[PDB]
Each structure stands twice: as structure tokens, then as C-alpha cells.
Amino acid sequence: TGSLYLWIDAHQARVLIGFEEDILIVSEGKMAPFTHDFRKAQQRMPAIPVNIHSMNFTWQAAGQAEYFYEFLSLRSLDKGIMADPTVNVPLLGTVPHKASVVQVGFPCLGKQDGVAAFEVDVIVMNSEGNTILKTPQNAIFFKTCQQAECPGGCRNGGFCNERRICECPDGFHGPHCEGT
Amino acid sequence: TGSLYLWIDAHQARVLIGFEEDILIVSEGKMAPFTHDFRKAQQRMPAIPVNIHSMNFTWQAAGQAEYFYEFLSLRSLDKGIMADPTVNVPLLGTVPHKASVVQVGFPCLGKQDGVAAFEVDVIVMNSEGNTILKTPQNAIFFKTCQQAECPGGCRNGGFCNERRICECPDGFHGPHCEGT
Numbered sequence: 001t002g003s004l005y006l007w008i009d010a011h012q013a014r015v016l017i018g019f020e021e022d023i024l025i026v027s028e029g030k031m032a033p034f035t036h037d038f039r040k041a042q043q044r045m046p047a048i049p050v051n052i053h054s055m056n057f058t059w060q061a062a063g064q065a066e067y068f069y070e071f072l073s074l075r076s077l078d079k080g081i082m083a084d085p086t087v088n089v090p091l092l093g094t095v096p097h098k099a100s101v102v103q104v105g106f107p108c109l110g111k112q113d114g115v116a117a118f119e120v121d122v123i124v125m126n127s128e129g130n131t132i133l134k135t136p137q138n139a140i141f142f143k144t145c146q147q148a149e150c151p152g153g154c155r156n157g158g159f160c161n162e163r164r165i166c167e168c169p170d171g172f173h174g175p176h177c178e179g180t
Numbered sequence: 181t182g183s184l185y186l187w188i189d190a191h192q193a194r195v196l197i198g199f200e201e202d203i204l205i206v207s208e209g210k211m212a213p214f215t216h217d218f219r220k221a222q223q224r225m226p227a228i229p230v231n232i233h234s235m236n237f238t239w240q241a242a243g244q245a246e247y248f249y250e251f252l253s254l255r256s257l258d259k260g261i262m263a264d265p266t267v268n269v270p271l272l273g274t275v276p277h278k279a280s281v282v283q284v285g286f287p288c289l290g291k292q293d294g295v296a297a298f299e300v301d302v303i304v305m306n307s308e309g310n311t312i313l314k315t316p317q318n319a320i321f322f323k324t325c326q327q328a329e330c331p332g333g334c335r336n337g338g339f340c341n342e343r344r345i346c347e348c349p350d351g352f353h354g355p356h357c358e359g360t
């Protein structure tokens with residue numbers, strides 16, 4: 001009957017938790033059993049590690065029915081640690097019929113070491129305009145961020161970003177912002 | 181008798197003041213006449229414009245005598261506008277026998293619009309260790325800086341630099357910090 005699916009692919013699941021198995025979140029339009037007691041599920045979710053800058057989710061609307069998604073909130077609650085999370089898709093759109101990857105980005109600013117709390121509130125609506133699936137109410141997620149330290153430092157008022165690349169200002173280029 | 185020379189080449193002078201003629205600063209080890217009444221010379225020096233990110237000076241120790249230079253202070257007095265000025269040579273060294281270019285950089289941070297005061301205190305010493313030439317005492321120079329505005333903006337907590345290039349953090353690349 002139901003056709004919506006949302007999962008984390010086996011390869012992405014391995015980098016995140018160590019087990020190379022698909023993590024099912026929604027199957028045939030129904031939330032996975034582990035999600036029903038959300039507070040218990042959240043306490044088993046560790047803070048996203050420093051080596052992970054983004055996460056891949058896979059979704060599909062596998063039948064003939066059309067479904068629409070909308071990202072209602074993409075918000076960091078610790079703006080000095082991490083900027084707002086991002087998605088590589090438009091904020092409102094159609095859930096694709098062919099299985100496709102949505103990349104959620106976690107932009108640590110590289111100014112502070114710490115854990116940033118953030119929100120990803122998304123809804124799925126059917127063609128009657130009713131919300132059929134959504135991020136559990138008041139859900140909070142966590143990301144571990146590190147202070148950036150570039151090899152050899154950044155000159156000319158430049159700053160190191162979390163990819164260990166120098167952020168060079170006006171008329172300055174190269175690995176350490178020396179060139180013109 | 182004297183052999184030291186310091187000048188601004190005709191091409192650099194044209195971009196700065198509009199006249200394509202070498203500007204002589206030191207000739208045969210003697211400060212140019214316009215420099216004697218330094219306060220009067222300073223009031224004829226306008227703030228370095230926004231389109232100029234660095235300036236080229238040319239120097240030479242044209243004889244057999246050896247001379248040593250030292251940059252004693254490279255300091256911005258308006259750190260929120262412009263970072264410390266820079267030079268593309270070691271802070272202490274030999275004045276070259278072959279005429280060579282020293283590039284002085286003015287790193288506007290791109291966070292504020294305004295004029296930054298700065299210092300470039302340099303000395304030249306002979307082989308007896310005595311200072312024979314130096315930046316006039318208490319000299320202040322000025323640089324016009326602009327707030328950076330990147331076309332299409334910088335995403336994922338990225339910031340625009342004064343070269344109109346996005347300063348992207350961890351695991352984010354491209355013109356607007358979208359890629360992974």
C-alpha cells in the first residue's frame with residue numbers, strides 16, 4: 001500500500017556507526033519501529049564525529065502517487081560553533097520516484113572546539129496537502145566540531161577553515177595567502 | 181660615493197598617482213628632497229585606494245659595499261579593518277646588488293569599510309652596524325578598505341574575502357561553499 005522509503009545506505013552507515021548495513025528510517029510510508037519511542041532512540045544517537053562533515057540519506061516515492069517534502073527548519077542552536085545545517089536540494093520539492101541521495105551538511109566554523117545542537121525539521125505531504133510524515137516534534141541532533149589549525153598557518157589576516165585550507169582575503173592567494 | 185637606491189617604478193607610480201614616472205625615494209644613499217619636511221610630504225600622501233591590495237618598491241645596493249635592511253615594525257593600528265602589512269622578503273637581510281622588487285601587502289579583512297592607519301618601520305645599516313637610513317620617526321600611512329560582497333554570497337558559514345572569493349570551511353568547496 002505505502003510507497004515512501006527513507007534510509008541510510010550501507011556505505012554511509014559503516015562510516016557513521018561501524019556496521020555496513022542499510023539503516024531503515026521509513027519503509028512503505030511507515031516510520032521504523034526504533035523511532036516510535038524517540039527519546040529512547042535519541043539517547044542511542046552519539047554526537048556526529050569531527051571527521052564527518054556531511055551525511056547522505058536516500059529516499060524514494062516508489063509508486064505512482066506523488067509526494068512533496070519541505071524543510072521547515074535547518075537551524076544551529078550554537079551559531080558560534082557550527083553554522084546552520086544545509087541540504088543539497090531545494091527546500092520544497094517532489095520526493096523523487098527514482099531513489100536519490102540528499103546530502104545534509106554540518107558546517108563547523110573552525111573557530112571553537114565543542115558540540116553544536118541543531119535541528120532538521122522536515123515534513124512529507126501527500127497530493128491532498130496533508131502531512132503524513134515528519135521529523136519527531138522537538139528533535140535535537142548533535143555535531144562534534146574542532147578548532148581549525150592549518151599547516152604553516154594563514155598569513156595576511158587569513159583564517160584556517162575546517163577542511164585545513166586557508167581562507168585568504170583580498171588579492172591574496174595560495175596555500176598560506178602569500179601570492180598576489 | 182653613495183650607492184643605495186629606493187624608488188617606485190614608473191608602472192606602479194601610474195596605478196597609484198596617475199603619472200608614469202619613477203618616484204625617487206633614496207638616491208646614492210641620500211633621502212629625496214621631498215622627504216626632508218616629512219609632515220608636509222605626508223599631507224600630500226592620500227589613503228591607498230580600495231583597488232590597490234599591494235605596492236611594489238624597487239631597491240638596490242649598486243656598488244661593492246654591503247648593506248643590511250631590517251623591518252622593525254609592520255603594524256596595523258586598526259586591526260578590525262586591515263591586518264598587519266606584510267613584505268615578500270625576510271625581515272632581516274642584505275640589500276641586493278641587482279635591482280629587485282619588494283612587494284608590501286595591505287590585507288583588508290573585508291569585514292568593515294573604512295581607513296586603516298599602519299606602520300612600515302624599516303632601517304638600513306652599513307657593514308659597521310650603524311643605521312644610515314630609516315623610515316622617518318612616527319610615520320603613519322593609510323589604506324582604504326571595503327566590506328566584502330561576493331556574487332551569490334557564501335553558504336555553509338563561509339565568508340567573502342576582499343578578492344571576491346568565498347572563504348569555505350571544513351569539507352566545503354567551490355564558488356559558494358556548496359560542494360563536498
Ligand SMILES: CCCCCCCCCCCCCCCC(=O)OC[C@H](COP(=O)([O-])OCC[N+](C)(C)C)OC(=O)CCCCCCCCCCCCCCC
Pocket residue numbers: 004005006016017023024025026034035041044045046048055057059060095102104120122123124133134135136141142
Ligand atoms: C533527507 C531527510 C533527513 C531526515 C533526517 C533528520 C536528521 C538529519 C540530521 C542528522 C541525524 C543523524 C545524527 C546521528 C548519527 C548517528 O549516530 O546515527 C546512527 C543511528 C543508530 O541507528 P542503529 O544503531 O542502526 O539502530 C537503528 C536501526 N536498527 C538497527 C535498530 C534497526 O541511526 C539514526 O539514529 C538515524 C538518525 C536519523 C533519524 C531521524 C528521523 C527523521 C524522520 C523524518 C521523517 C520525514 C521525512 C520522510 C521522507 C520519506
Ligand SMILES: CCCCCCCCCCCCCCCC(=O)OC[C@H](COP(=O)([O-])OCC[N+](C)(C)C)OC(=O)CCCCCCCCCCCCCCC
Pocket residue numbers: 184185186196197203204205206214215221224225226228235237239240275282284300302303304313314315316321322
Ligand atoms: C621596501 C621599503 C619600503 C619603504 C616605504 C615605507 C612606506 C610603505 C607603505 C606605503 C607608502 C605609500 C602610501 C602612499 C601612496 C602614495 O600616494 O604615494 C604617492 C606619493 C606622491 O609622490 P609624488 O607626488 O611623486 O611627489 C614626490 C616626488 N616628486 C615628484 C615630488 C619628485 O609618493 C610617496 O609619498 C611615496 C611614499 C613612501 C615614502 C616613505 C619613506 C620611506 C623611506 C625608507 C628609508 C629606509 C629604506 C632605504 C632603502 C634603500
Ligand SMILES: *[C@@H]1O[C@H](CO)[C@@H](O)[C@H](O)[C@H]1NC(C)=O
Pocket residue numbers: 011012015056101103
Ligand atoms: C555521499 O553521496 C555522494 C553522492 O554521490 C558520494 O559522492 C559520497 O561519496 C557519499 N559519501 C558517503 C560517506 O557515502
Ligand SMILES: *[C@@H]1O[C@H](CO)[C@@H](O)[C@H](O)[C@H]1NC(C)=O
Pocket residue numbers: 191192195236281283
Ligand atoms: C609588482 O611586481 C610584481 C613582480 O613581478 C609584478 O608581477 C606585478 O605586476 C607588479 N605590480 C604593479 C602594479 O606593477
Ligand code: NA
Pocket residue numbers: 153154155157158159160
Ligand atoms: Na592565520
Ligand code: NA
Pocket residue numbers: 333334335337338339340
Ligand atoms: Na556568507
